Amino acid sequence: TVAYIAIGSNLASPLEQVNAALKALGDIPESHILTVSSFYRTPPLGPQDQPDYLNAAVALETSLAPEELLNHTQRIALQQGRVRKAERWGPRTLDLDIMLFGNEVINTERLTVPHYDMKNRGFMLWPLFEIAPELVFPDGEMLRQILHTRAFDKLNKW
């Protein structure tokens, strides 16, 4: 099954943080990276001197069940994030989210797929469109149309 995963980081030097997450994704059991988007840049909100977020989308082929894949993405987030050194929240973070899982709709306390807010996040949609321009959501919406009809912040490549 093809799952689409969002990666985001504003940790340390984000380029290598994201490369580490990618390596970890490829090391998930029964799973293989099919393609990775370009790396995109999201500025922080407000005047503060805060680091930019690096965003990417990954197509991962997997024979894992959705909640099994979630165990792994949560594990990698913990292991690679500075959760132990810093705090769960941030403000500096490594985010790994399952955006889509095949054509499945999952509504559980642990897992909601499609990701609940992805259709409002240009930093998820633009990278996803780069790697899956013909994508159609489970509810029938075409990714290509959402990008024509919703307002998103300008998103430059990293």
Nearer to Cl ion (CB atom), residue 71 or residue 103: 103
Gap between the terminal Cα atoms of the chain: 29
CB of residue 107 vs Cl ion: minimum separation in angstroms?
Answer: 11
Between the alpha carbon of residue 78 and those of residues 47, 73, 133, the distances in Å are: 29, 9, 31
Q: Is 153 a catalytic residue?
A: no
> Toward Cl ion, which CB reaches closer, 2 or 33?
2
SS3 77: helix
Closest CB to Cl ion among residues 14, 66 = 66
Nearest distance in Å: CB 77, Cl ion: 24
Give me the half-sphere count of Cα atoms (radius 13 Å) on the Cβ side of residue 134.
0
Give min distance, CB of 153 to Cl ion, in A. 22
The catalytic position among 84, 88, 97, 150 is 97
Q: Is 144 a catalytic residue?
A: no
Distance CA 78, CA 92 (A): 13
Q: Cβ of 114: how many Cβ atoms within 10 Å? A: 20
Q: Is 49 a catalytic residue?
A: no
Q: List contacts with Cl ion (CB under 5 A).
A: 114, 137-139
Active site residue 52: no
Catalytic positions are 82, 92, 95, 97
